[PDB]
């Protein structure tokens, strides 16, 4: 059948099992726009106020999915504004195919043209950046761009498609590439492999299983909470990996890091060998800067890149999380040592019990103040007597990131939302219309620094237009906090930390948002309920300290270097000038 | 003497003449705000909502300034919000160096790294892109984009400092260079060729100069102003060199193109010999899609990569624009066929003002209305009732575009300002801001659409802070007007296009900005009056139609193509298989 | 200890287990040369006539080992030179460590500057580009590019060092990492997976295994025999894959491709079901130029990224080639339908041993005639009268390529040796010569057309000087045959193919190589038994045909395409001009 290039993408997208659009219209996209209108996709598209707004909803939608299930399609220049979210899905694995509908082909090249878009400048961004010749390659390119979003490492691909193939016509037989199996994930371990590791964790005193994101991308949830129990050894997490084992349970120390809980930080420390599942040992996850001393540790990851990169682990082994768990549950009873025992009665118990409640007490004295200037871990506090299992807390970056990551105890996987492989500003608003698309099921409560909302609030549109219920609180302090607290750590002095807030129950309530202030009530709680009833999106203003959080609050870190001292740097002596001392000699 | 990183980028800024500072914190621009902070640049940095918005406020200041006199400096990953602002730059001719200070060189190349931002995305879209190794080189990579900033063509420099490097110290001799001067642009033309142009330009029956931004930049309203009165020629300009020639004068035309006067249109296709100074004769100009058809043409630019690129001049001279001018009017008088006299009694003036007549009255008509929605071009006829030659008028893209270019009448260089290049969506209101910051003592008056004002409304914070009291009319007519209308066109259906607006005026209110909407009273007047009595940033809104402007208005117009036809291609028959489609010849 | 940054370097290559260093001095290369004269590894340094040469002594090293085991190491101008024989490494999967020296890092940048190396240029290319800024970075890198370039899938890294920091010294405490582990490749597939294959190869009728290069680096050359021997399946393999499988054994029907035998391609047209082990069906491989009809298919890979790039299979599994072998093997005796029967017996055995006699038959009518011109068949015949089963054989690109192919008749793996997955002109003498420094218990037999020997003959004083005795065959029609061949069945008539040699027994004499031609005797026989004799690396100069092999010899393939024929391309009717046309419209 003749096709346009524009029906032709459509059904490509269909295709690979895309649910959810983000999309901006201008000539380059009317085809496409126009494609989508007369499909069953054409129900779910989101025109965002801004291409990097959009973009963050497609990461935080694909972040709780695991897959491309939203796409992002735009005309020629929006292309220009996706960076930044595209490099947070690089290095946080995030699946993320995005179409570039760039200006007409005819017109590439001519130096005086408008609206060339430059996609070379994806590709130090993209896993996959691809720019269409050819009007019978498009729905080639977008199979590869899936499969290798999809892939192991997840992340973008992008696809260029000059505007003038979409208008094009060609008879579409087998265009579409139809039919696509793909491998199994659950790759096996050796024997060996596994009565090694088994024999690791028997022998060990004090061992810690610590479980990253690909845990969570495994489906490894129930395996980790039998292999815990069974060999009767305490739980640390990545940020990523939170929720993969219940919070609640007596072996729960939460995530390792500088933001994370000093129950974990303090078994990190004490412990004589770590299993390692799922986690890339990431610069600002358990690297902490590259500072973090790991013990004596197995690692275990699909992704061979990750694997002694920068820890020389005692054995490294190419398999799945969920399936490597498995095969050790199977090779325990057969394990010299191994005793079957009620994980309470285990010798190394207590000391984790005791870490545990020592940050459990801490945490209680961050949250049982009242008044103004509210508590973050009080705020949270809040939000967990109103919080149901399958809730999705997200947060932006700055000083209110450790009490958001602090206060939330998550009972299953991809519940904790943000930039978190690149800790990218403003990400926290658009990521959470993200997540809600994706998660109709969830309420997802925001903790968003004042400077951070700053950036895509514009996106209220989206969220009322489409009711989307997210509840947000914005922590005000009129500052870049975390940046106001380190420099004066630093320095004595900060610098260009500080600003102006607007009336944000006025914005919230000029967008139609419930809004809400709890300057001088201090009723976080009735505001919550207040927030839920209306059910729009809500916005919550709740004023906070500069200081509390990430830049100060002692979790046990150790890292990472950002107030790096200098050094003092030999100058060259070999003879060669700088640029303009010529005059200098005269 | 021993000096940190730090404020070996602070001197070397200053020392190239860095005027305004657009900075964005974080840990990796911690030693630099710091050594700011020690300087007379610091007193007046701006921190803007976004970085995104602040490059389009250093954009803004340069444009009108001719020289990267603003800057950016950059915390790592928010450098990866620059690259729309920096296209335009690019293919815009705006000087600007933008200071991205990246994570420290320690972690760099290792693959789980956070926050090492790919410097090598902005290759392909600065003019100049560099990486710094070395403290012993901060000094001189600052010097080289400065540079190439504001060199022929101009545009953008990005320079990535691993921030260590900020806090490391050197001993200070020699590594900024300083004491340089540049060569001179006053680059003359042949006397041949100044003489082949003067006899083309007296032997032609209807003549036009076609004067561009390279005018403005040249410094040659003067010069353009004796010349057409010399000869007695109608001037036509582009979006960049409107206001080089006065627009009130009788022989001024207006800007050609798909968006401009339809005097100036009707000009171009009445010439027959155009003389073209600093123009790039670019898509979304004079070549409206590379549809125009130009007549037989002299051109004139300082960049010999404009010349010949696409359309063939008779002549091509490699010279500054107010220098050639110069050499043309000291020969004229000796040229053979030349005649004193007043350009009003020329053979070919009737014809000019019977063209500036029709589109002025065309113009008049689109100002006439009694209700509500309002026009566009009526708030623009309110606003040249409270203009002066110094003010600045701004646009974002879309329908609104055209009533903007069509109701400015300028009479100074550089009073335009938009994303001219590249019709980057949203560049309205921080360039505004940007333009206020370069020129205080003008006022500012900006009309954008509501999808537009969407993107860097945020940046109110910086004009409330800095009571930077830009005049912004918002055009609300809940859609992407130009699309709706377009599509509507195309298929018979819109789609994409519909959007809620917010209450503007209680956005502006929670900022502190002035509000005033003038859905019910029609009264544009008294609200640019009350906005300009209350010396805050103002918002206006002005509902108006979905199909007013540039998807509707006939101006003249040939291009660009952008409602394409498709073609219908043929299969390739070579017998190689689409992926996949093995499983189809199974049996 | 205080370290010389060139030290350090030297440190690092030897660490991770470079044997052998391809080097060319200059300047910027200085310091390194002198730490290599004071290591072990100085003792194995080839100096090349040229870079681009010794880039292909790399290659030819690497591919037989399997691992990165010979390093380039180059004055930073001579790094210009090695393009072409790293996008070989890229899509050959050949391991290979490039360290590029450039100048002063205190003077990149500057416009004037000379012989700064645009390092970017490998960007495209290598599977790593690093360009190093830090002494203290050196060992990371090094360490970094082995870990990529060894990987999967392998190939080559390029590492920028400005020589500055190789002369600047620092204290080495800790800078090499030492201890580096790595993890098994010895992944398994799940047993639902390996049951669905078994249970496929025993319900076909006329089933193929297709073993490839893969087969070859997994060492599954034991398990492949078992298998096809126990389930009674003919072996079709790629040329990378070639001699994993004897191929003088019943079963044995040859590669497939178009310069592969008959009787594999006869059996890939017959088959109904095939086992693809560690290959990537790749353009000028299997698939032929995506013409190749693949039948119903399991493919078996280490790398996903390969898996239902193109083919669409029945079932894409991860997993080691020997292992999923060895997983087949237990898993058939329970496999329904299963019968332990000779493989003499089974009803498909006929039809695959007439397949090869009919290509046998074929050959021997190739091979058998005397005289001159030669055939190339015959020259093939002569070697294997002398040839071992450890002895390697290379070619280079062009007609002799086929008969060089198909007259190859081997028994152990990695012994075919050539620009395979790019087909660049010139590689085989240097290919050979780094063969034969990784092999030094093997006979290296080069087959070269004259047009190739052209490229790096210059490379004979490497040869001589390092007493590596390859047999080179360079087989002379004063021609760029397969393009004469193809051009005259394209166009009637031949432009740009014919030259002039020179006295390759001259040219070999000169530099103090045994050289003999047969143009008068024929003598082949003798040739190579006076060449082997010499001890010398030899030169037999034989004429052939413009014609014969890959361009014109009928060995039942299907593609590539590359005589395409033009379509007439419809003009733009959009209303826009071309460059200079408004001169037409005056
Ligand atoms: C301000 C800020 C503070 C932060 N604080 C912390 C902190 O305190 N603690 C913390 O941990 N992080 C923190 N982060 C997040 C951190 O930067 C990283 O994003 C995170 O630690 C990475 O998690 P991960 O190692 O689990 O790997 P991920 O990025 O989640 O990657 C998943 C890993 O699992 C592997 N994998 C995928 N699927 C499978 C499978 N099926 N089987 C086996 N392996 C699989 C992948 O190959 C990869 O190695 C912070 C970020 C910011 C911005
Ligand atoms: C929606 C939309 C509508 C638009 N509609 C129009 C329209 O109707 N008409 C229009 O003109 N544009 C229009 N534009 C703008 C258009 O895209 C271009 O930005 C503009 O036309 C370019 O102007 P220019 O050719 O003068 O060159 P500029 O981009 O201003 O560049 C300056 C030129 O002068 C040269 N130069 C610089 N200094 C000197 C010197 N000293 N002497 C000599 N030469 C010098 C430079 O090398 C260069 O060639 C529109 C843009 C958008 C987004
Ligand atoms: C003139 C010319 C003619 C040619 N003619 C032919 C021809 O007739 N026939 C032919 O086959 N080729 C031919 N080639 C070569 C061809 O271009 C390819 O180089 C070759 O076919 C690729 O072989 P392969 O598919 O086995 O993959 P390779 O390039 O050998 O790659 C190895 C594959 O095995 C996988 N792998 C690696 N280790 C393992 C493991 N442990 N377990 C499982 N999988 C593993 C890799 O991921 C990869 O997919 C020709 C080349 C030229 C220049
Ligand atoms: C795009 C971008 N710009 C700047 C930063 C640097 N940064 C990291 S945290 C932070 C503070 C954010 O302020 P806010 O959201 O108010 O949170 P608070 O620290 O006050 O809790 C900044 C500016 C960044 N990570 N990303
Ligand atoms: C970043 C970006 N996204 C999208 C476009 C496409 N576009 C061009 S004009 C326009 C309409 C803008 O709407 P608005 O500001 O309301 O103006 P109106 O057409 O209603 O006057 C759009 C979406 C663009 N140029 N840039
Ligand atoms: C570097 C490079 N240049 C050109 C070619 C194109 N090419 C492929 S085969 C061939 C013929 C080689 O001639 P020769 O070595 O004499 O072999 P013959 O065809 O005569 O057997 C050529 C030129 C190539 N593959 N690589
Ligand atoms: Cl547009
Ligand atoms: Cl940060
Ligand atoms: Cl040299
Ligand atoms: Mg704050
Ligand atoms: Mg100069
Ligand atoms: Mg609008
Ligand atoms: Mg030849």
């Not at 504004?81 to 993320?96: D, N, S, W």
């Not at 265009?175 to 024997?191: D, E, M, Q, Y």
């Not at 709740?542 to 950002?562: C, E, R, Y």
């Amino acid at each position: 059948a003749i096709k346009r290039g524009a029906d032709l993408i459509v059904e490509a997208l269909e295709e690979y099992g895309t649910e959810q659009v983000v999309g901006f219209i201008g000539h380059t996209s009317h085809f496409v726009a126009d494609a989508f209108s007369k499909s069953h996709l054409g129900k779910r598209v989101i025109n965002p106020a801004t291409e990097l707004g959009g973009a963050w909803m497609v990461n935080g939608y694909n972040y709780v999915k695991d897959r491309s299930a939203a796409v992002g399609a735009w005309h020629c220049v929006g292309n220009l504004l996706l960076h930044a979210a595209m490099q947070e899905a690089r290095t946080g694995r995030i699946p993320a195919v995005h179409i570039g509908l760039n200006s007409d082909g005819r017109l590439a090249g001519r130096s005086e043209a408008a609206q060339q878009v430059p996609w070379q400048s994806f590709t130090p961004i993209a896993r996959s950046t691809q720019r269409v010749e050819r009007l019978d390659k498009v729905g080639e390119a977008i199979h590869e761009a899936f499969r290798v979003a999809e892939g192991h490492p997840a992340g973008p691909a992008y696809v260029d498609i000059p505007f003038d193939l979409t208008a094009d016509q060609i008879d579409d037989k087998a265009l579409v590439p139809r039919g696509a199996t793909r491998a199994k994930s659950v790759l096996h371990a050796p024997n060996e492999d596994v009565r090694e590791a088994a024999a690791q964790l028997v022998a060990a005193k004090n061992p810690v299983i610590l479980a990253g994101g690909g845990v969570a991308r495994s489906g490894g949830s129930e395996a980790l909470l039998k292999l815990a129990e069974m060999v009767g050894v305490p739980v640390v997490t990545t940020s990523t990996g939170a929720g993969v084992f219940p919070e609640t349970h007596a072996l729960a120390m939460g995530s390792a890091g500088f933001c994370g809980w000093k129950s974990a930080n303090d078994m990190m420390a004490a412990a004589d060998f770590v299993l390692v599942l799922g986690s890339r040992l990431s610069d600002w996850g358990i690297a902490q800067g590259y500072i973090t001393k790991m013990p004596k540790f197995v690692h275990v990851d699909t992704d061979p890149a990750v694997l002694g990169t920068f820890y020389f682990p005692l054995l490294s082994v190419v398999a799945d999380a969920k399936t490597f768990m498995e095969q050790l549950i199977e090779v325990l009873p057969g394990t010299s040592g191994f005793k079957a025992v009620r994980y309470q009665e285990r010798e190394n118990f207590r000391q984790a019990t005791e870490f545990r409640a020592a940050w459990d007490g801490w945490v209680r004295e961050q949250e049982s103040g009242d008044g103004m200037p509210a508590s973050m871990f009080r705020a949270m506090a809040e939000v967990r007597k109103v919080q149901r299992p399958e809730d999705i807390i997200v947060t932006d970056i700055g000083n209110h990131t450790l009490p958001m990551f602090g206060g939330a105890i998550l009972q299953r996987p991809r519940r904790l939302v943000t930039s978190m492989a690149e800790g990218i500003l403003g990400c926290g608003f658009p990521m959470a219309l993200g997540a809600q698309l994706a998660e109709p099921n969830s309420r997802v409560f925001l903790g968003t620094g004042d400077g951070a909302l700053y950036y895509h609030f514009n996106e209220f549109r989206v969220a009322v237009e489409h009711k989307l219920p997210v509840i947000t609180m914005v922590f005000t302090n009129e500052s870049y906090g975390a940046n106001w607290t380190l420099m004066n750590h630093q320095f004595g002095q900060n610098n260009w930390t500080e600003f102006m807030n607007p009336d944000w129950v006025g914005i919230a309530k000029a967008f139609g948002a419930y809004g809400e202030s709890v300057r001088e009530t201090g009723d976080i709680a009735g505001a919550l309920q207040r927030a839920i009833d209306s059910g729009k999106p809500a916005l919550i203003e709740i004023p906070v300290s500069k200081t509390q959080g990430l830049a100060s609050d002692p979790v046990g870190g150790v890292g990472p270097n950002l107030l790096l001292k200098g050094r003092e740097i030999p100058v060259d002596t070999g003879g060669s000038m700088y640029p303009g001392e010529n005059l200098l000699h005269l």
